[model samples]
Target: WGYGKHNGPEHWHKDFPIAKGERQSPVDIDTHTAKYDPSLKPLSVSYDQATSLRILNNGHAFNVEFDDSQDKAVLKGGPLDGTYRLIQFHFHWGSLDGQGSEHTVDKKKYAAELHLVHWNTKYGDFGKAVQQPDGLAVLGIFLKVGSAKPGLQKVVDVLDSIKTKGKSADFTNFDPRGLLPESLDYWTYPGSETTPPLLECVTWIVLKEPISVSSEQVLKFRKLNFNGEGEPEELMVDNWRPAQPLKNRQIKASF
Candidate 1:
């Protein structure tokens, strides 16, 4: 019931009916069709490195959990109505280099994608936020093969320890801002979680600029296993969901 041919995105709608719901996530971005909105404000991001707690492989992908009890690390402006506090960040990559990102541009896929997940503070907690229509904001940055990214190298270096599912290690004081591209330009849309239970409550802000990652660095991520220690190996790759139908949604650009 994972990202296999038997039960991947193709079969998710059978269990989570919302998978085929309008405004589903990871839609292909047809740049020509994206509207440039003058009212779209500049996004504001402030992160307190101390809020970073641990990095863990949660069977599907590895995520760096954050201490979201406070508003120290938050996202504001742009497409958000209120502040959204960062809870965790994870990545989706492929077996090889060219086809892993969930969101594509004009049918072009990237090497990987990074998701910074945050919850709307007005809804009380992440639990309650997920139930609201505008409860979460996910900042997505694409990763492409090129020169080594110093920021990403920090996360890549720790992959050896958390090589299997459910394994985690302390990874604190890591600044994720370094992983973002120089340009904050992005495409904003209303969408659902790419994963199952596909709640249609996310406000997705996908950056137009991509970050650089060396082939060797991306190989480290492929080493992680979806299975736990002592179990048969199941390398965690192609954890990304394919682009869903855009349907009635409009993709607005913040230039």
Candidate 2:
């Protein structure tokens, strides 16, 4: 059931795929025609040590909830209003050579992708964050399959804890900020969630440069259990979604 051809993005439409009239994120952003507002300021977010208590095995993805909270960063005149809280983070990856990322660049596919999901602090919780258009900010980072990236090792070291399906490893005293690249330069756009029920109002920030990961590390992700029992279902091949229509929305880059 987890074979690449049927479960993969190429053949996904046969089973279940995105429907018409749905807004998706991670469109191929063309920087040339984008508008740059000098008055728009960068968001301020601070990171510190925190413990993740709840880990959701959503079948398609994984989400780790933090016990602590941080102040919402202000983005004036942007897509969203008020401050947003860092709720959780997850990833989107492919199982094979042809597909691996949710977003594309110049029609080019990457090895994988990561998303840091945040909610509006005014809502006080992630549940509330999902209900409003201005309630979420998803920070996306691209990963290319190659030599293992140095920073990724920190996260991979803990993969064993959550490798099996429906399993969650308690990660105490782990800092999510450690996974961030040194550069904060990114491309920002107004979009919606990539998954179904495709709620709009997400402030997406995609990093310009992609991080590197070795073939072995990528294989580890593919080995994750999908069905919980019996042989582990290889469901990760070509999990990426192609870029969506721009729909006249302008993208901005922090250069």
Candidate 3:
């Protein structure tokens, strides 16, 4: 059973009953207080250099980690100096019409959430990627349930291959860069990881435009299993937390 009403985000720990040390990724953003900085420069990352792609079954969401071996992006005099490796990417969504999104647009909620995780190459490895300002950069894309989006079809095509819990499939010969929207215009801000260890070094780039996925496709994601070994299958219901407090952070929008 999931957390009941009155036991939501504030008391999720007591409601869901997970390990004391378990890390949870909840959305915490405050748009009203966000200040936009005009001097921020755009960072460029190339798709031609991403190396390997590994897909995993984390019982909650299908995650893919990419290798950024020869990337040619420049981080414009920020804290990051060396190349950053694309580490992992994941998603968050709702079970019905009113929930499952992290960041809101002008206070509007979407149907799902997608995150692309990257680490600073200067750290040498992703393990060391979270310790510095340039240590992390996450590309966030919002998804709504509606018409089928061509960009996400590649991910949907492989759904049947990893439909059960603890089941992972290799997505070799697949280039995830193709999943990125044609336009790179986005909203940038400095925030902590939406998940635990809530490090404060993440440079967040959230897309202004959102992608669409059919209701059927959305249902496939909702049908995920979250039960431990031998336990009855627990439907992956309500895979999202409410948006977080912006904490006086500034959000920058790109046209």
Candidate 4:
């Protein structure tokens, strides 16, 4: 089951079961209820710019994978118990403007969301780590419609090449750190993947500051296809799952 009316987030529980689970992701962050922790340290992001391999469309979101065999890219500090290796990064967006981020702040959604996925080295591979609660650390960056973001132009330049399912191309020398917002202040909580095979291994770290993007850049994402080569031309937009329940989960802010 994929993301759609027939077999989307609502129907994922039919197969995945965890869709109705207690700690799901893309939650509405009520900042008033968020506790400010003085102990939470600044997020340490050490990225190997050359580690970026290629960009691919898995008929879902386009993922720019990296070489993680070595500790090429890693995330430390910021509410993490141990080191997590940078695996890959992808995005979730909308067809129209002003919608599509997986995680929202006080019910206010952003234009898009960027997911920097990492797996704890303590648990080995992402496959093995995903089964454990503290295995993955997904850093979320909110994309807003504003002045253009030149740092992201390099990736946008390649979107057309991978507009169809299974399409990909070499994407290297691109620094993932350049995509981050100025502030490392973030909200931390336990959550699951917003997509199918909904693993609850993610410790979500969503940024308080949002990055700027022009509508021109966002329009290109809509050109991507959900089904490849004209199988009705289902454009891949709004592929994000809405906010899920936050049953008894406390969200902490590291500011």
All candidates in order of TM-score, best leading: 1, 4, 2, 3
The C-alpha TM-scores of every prediction are: 0.98, 0.81, 0.79, 0.97
Model 3 ranges off by over 4 Å: 1-36, 68-82, 228-230
Q: Arrange candidates, best lDDT first.
A: 1, 4, 2, 3
lDDT of every predicted structure (CA atoms):
0.92, 0.66, 0.64, 0.90
Which of the two candidates, 1 or 4, achieves a greater lDDT against the reference?
A: 1
Query: lDDT tens digits, residues 176-216, model 2?
Result: 76666666667788787776545675888777777778888
Per-residue C-alpha lDDT of model 4 across residues 1-255, encoded as one tens digit per residue: 767889787888998888889899889999999999999999999885439899999999899999999888999999998889988999999877778899889899999999999999988788899889899999999999999998899999999899889889999888887798888999999998888778888999999999999999998888899888667888898899999889999999996
Per residue, candidate 3 scores C-alpha lDDT tens digits across 155-181 of 777766665567677765555566566
Best by TM-score: 1
RMSD of each: 0.9, 3.7, 4.5, 1.1
Candidate 1, residue 235: Cα displacement in angstroms equals 1.0
Candidate 2, superposed: residue stretches over 4 Å from native: 1-19, 54-56, 68-81
Q: How close is candidate 3 to the true structure, as a TM-score?
A: 0.79
Report how far off residue 204 is in candidate 4 (Å): 0.6
lDDT of 1 at 103: 98
* Candidate 4 lDDT score at position 81: 84
